[PDB]
Point group: C4
Chain length 333, copies 4
């Protein structure tokens, strides 16, 4: 029998590693952190100066965040937990601040096609078909319909996935980028409520195995707690990282300051939390420390990435994606 039980070796299909399971190995380097090139592909066509996108969540990204993110060289994805007219107006607001990149989330519900067309009319650059489970005909069909209808002017992202097969399906549907993350989010309770998930380093490695041969960038979404996690996600093969928790504490996120026991916080909640759905939960409502301006958070995050590129001899993100890991033990934390 199989050492962990039963007679089927495929029952337990893999050993899933998360960020805390690995470290980047230093390598020969003539790259100074200050000189590394941090640009990377968000989608097949769109390159960002900084490989970071803010999550499509209503305690993270509305117009103010999208504007600050694009000015910092990344991009925001506007959340979709509001009327179609307001979302499109947020898109327009970002555009009124210059030639700034902006994305917007849509679902696959009755109302999604209308939403997508309104955002298109508003001048959106990227449409993110954004769902709990993208390995599904309705999601694949929406990705394909958008790519064939508005595809030559708008880039279309599909997510989220957690396996090589799911990512391959989005590639075949025409996705211009694939977003990876089922289970790892800081406010996510999918793992405890449904018992479902995939540790994020293994999920990225698997998705990249399906996406890289086709020139489709992977967006690592969820579970990033530290600047060093960004470096790890990219070295695992992702081209960008999507941040929720790390940006929800910033001045530019929606929400006000909360003072508890003399310290400053902001509210941060899952899109699957009770309160987000009353606008069986798979997300919580919580708080995160107030962090100040976005520009300052992004500076330290990018600083950590630059440090990693120095250590690994990576002049570009493309080079970082070829870096090697060491696996650590439980004693290692």
């Amino acid at each position: 029998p199989v050492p962990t039980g039963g007679d089927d070796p495929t029952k337990i299909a893999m050993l899933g590693l998360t960020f805390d399971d690995v470290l980047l190995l230093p390598a020969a380097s003539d790259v100074l952190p200050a000189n590394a090139d941090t640009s990377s592909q968000l989608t097949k066509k769109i390159r960002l100066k900084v490989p970071l996108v803010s999550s499509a969540m209503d305690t993270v990204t509305e117009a103010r965040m999208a504007i600050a993110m694009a000015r910092a060289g990344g991009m925001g994805v506007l959340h979709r937990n509001l009327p179609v007219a307001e979302q499109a107006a947020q898109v327009e607001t970002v555009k009124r601040s210059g030639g700034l990149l902006v994305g917007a989330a849509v679902g696959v519900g009755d109302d999604a096609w209308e939403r997508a067309m309104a955002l298109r009319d508003a001048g959106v650059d990227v449409l993110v078909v954004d769902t709990a489970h993208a390995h599904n005909r309705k999601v694949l069909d929406m990705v394909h319909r958008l790519k064939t209808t508005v595809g030559d002017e708008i880039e279309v992202v599909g997510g989220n996935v957690a396996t090589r097969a799911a990512a391959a399906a989005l590639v075949e549907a025409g996705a211009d980028a694939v977003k990876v993350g089922v289970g790892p989010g800081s406010i996510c309770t999918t793992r405890v409520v449904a018992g479902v998930g995939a540790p994020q380093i293994t999920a990225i490695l698997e998705a990249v195995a399906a996406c890289a041969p086709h020139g489709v960038p992977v967006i690592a979404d969820g579970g990033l707690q530290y600047s060093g996690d960004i470096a790890k996600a990219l070295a695992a093969g992702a081209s960008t990282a999507m941040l929720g928790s790390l940006l929800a504490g910033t001045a530019e996120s929606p929400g006000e300051l909360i003072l508890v026991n003399g310290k400053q916080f902001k509210s941060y909640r899952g899109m699957g939390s009770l309160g987000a759905m009353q606008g069986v939960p798979e997300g919580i409502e919580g708080r995160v420390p107030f962090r100040g301006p976005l520009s300052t958070v992004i500076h330290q995050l990018v600083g950590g990435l630059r440090a990693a590129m120095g250590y690994t001899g990576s002049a570009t993100i493309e080079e970082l994606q070829q870096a090697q890991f060491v696996q650590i033990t439980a004693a290692g934390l």
Copy 2:
């Protein structure tokens, strides 16, 4: 020598995984959580609408719980820590509330045959031969005697086991279902007192390898803490889950509200605890948070299961039983 010591490779026979060691992998799916079919076999003949049974414990299941459980589409197993006449009367009470399914525990002591016949007379549907260690001639003989005597009107469950061989023995004795769990219970101290046990995912996989080829359902009993654990136990191959801790906090369980430090609790104790035996302990007496009505707890539990069936593309429990896992590391919690 063997890497862990000595010269015998069979000394340390396997690596045992528990619920926290695994996650369900998302898979291609056209199944909406709301549309999944949650029915499953309790025994060879009996199918439940909801794959959940309440434990035969005196702080969990008396008539009120059995009634609420059957109305929710599951079943209760009446505990046996009272006189034969009272247990049979509880059986009758459940039946007075309609054509509701109900089970009842018996042991293998002098008094067990009399108990079993009285419950039969009371109209019980399922008899559960329920013991700390079922891999034993007296237990096997009782299972067989019941199956040959009352077997065509009553289904007979045997438990508990933790190995492929033990489950195979119950199958050969005529069990209509096999119950798995030695060591994993929340109030169980078998692991620390006797040093005995089997991690529950590996125990289910092993028991299913013996039971499924013979069409005998496995009941996963003990160690379930979250709705996601129910999904994991079924995907490991079990057909139903038995709950103690998760239901002991409910309005319908025996026992009154306990107020400690401004919060509400109910008493929850092992059948092998001092107080359960004074009616060398292998169970504790504890408290669990008061949770309100059973209907509400079952709704969230079934909600979590439906979510898992959506993620895994499982239209039925039978399909869920073929789902795949990823193993996670210690960093994964």
Copy 3:
């Protein structure tokens, strides 16, 4: 290269398991806990009714403990942190309480031969050559000298060891039992101070591989925290268990009651602690909860063992020594 570094596969020689790493697997059984036979060989010649010996420590075993232990069916080993005359007088005191078995520790210092002869004269049954590191010519020579001089009337134990080779050396020197434990003691700081040790399940398996073929019993010494650990140590192949921590809280141990924050304690200290040596430390001075009479502690310990013998179908300790383990993961605790 070797996956953990360097080019030498023998550098990291084995994966060491401790008690918490394993569980005993239930097996077919017709043995009732109440009926199991708990007797076992302390030495080649001496069998105990209960497979438990108290440590040769000055906060655990003086005459009162030795007397209580023998009456409970085990034995005490009198510590040697006092003058030769007092130790011998303690031996005599035990003998004045009937035909009770008693052992006594000696070292390998200048004074040890004199000590050994005085204890012999006092009527001691077992001499324990007791040292931090027995894999050493002076220890081997002392074991052999005693066996050739007083060996036909007194049994001679040697310890402590942690490897197959060390145990083999004591067997060749003539030891009648071998004591295993370098590093695992509750009050031991050898692991942090010297960086030396061996996880106790692997140490027992290795020592038994050297001792069992020669009919020499292994005494598992140190690291036992729960009654279930006793069962594990014996199933790993040991014939008896030596207890320090578990008995230091008892009425019969040396030392008085200590009241701290409304709860009762006794002092418990390593023989290598500062205070034991002032009569570079490798042991601490601590407290353990007061537990009451020895008889009560031994009853629960033996109760747990009986439970294990029931679960594993072990009618005798000899049978228990053939039981199988499952290895558990970090999530398993």
Copy 4:
């Protein structure tokens, strides 16, 4: 696919062990701790009586520490976070206290060559080219330039490295010793900020595989918390250990006593901390317990090492470097 994801087996290159992952196995021994020879090579030419060097940090080693360390039989490395004139004057101060060994850190910046020549003029014995990442042409060139210019009178150390290849590069550049440690320091945040590092036992094993064949000693730098860690680092093949945390609490380190909540502390900060750089941080500012005189700390540290040499039968450090480990599990701590 590879069990942890993707199709490349080299992506995750190794399993990295840290000190807490291993223990030294006791071995046959005729070596008394008091009699072991603790001397070891700092560099190809320089042997120390005690295999310990103090870190080049401004809360650890200035003239007072360098003096105390050499008198204890080790050496100090003077930090370089001050003007060239003051560092050279510290070197001279040490020399005014007798024929004491002393080292000094230099970087690879514009000012480093001048620094190195001034320290040379001051009578320094060892120059340590000391950087976050030594696997780099500028570092290799500096090591080589120093070795060819002042190499016959001064020994030249290069660091830090974490891989076999990096250490091989320093050997080829002419290093007289190689210093190992990227990530493990107590005040280091490289792992969380950059996601970069190498567990220290595996890093030492790998570096030694490159250095030992060429007769170049390895200095184990960072992550040492206990005296037992020193023994482990040497048995892994290092010839000396560099200490920061363990010595920063001593009377001889720079800094004053800090009283917080009735207990005594000293400040201890990374050279990459904000405050060290304001003279994106990769080190913190913290406190360590005040420990008293250096002589006392070194005595217990050397005591622990002697204990390890006794247990492993190592008469010399060279013998200790051939000792074997056992790997432990997470339960092992």
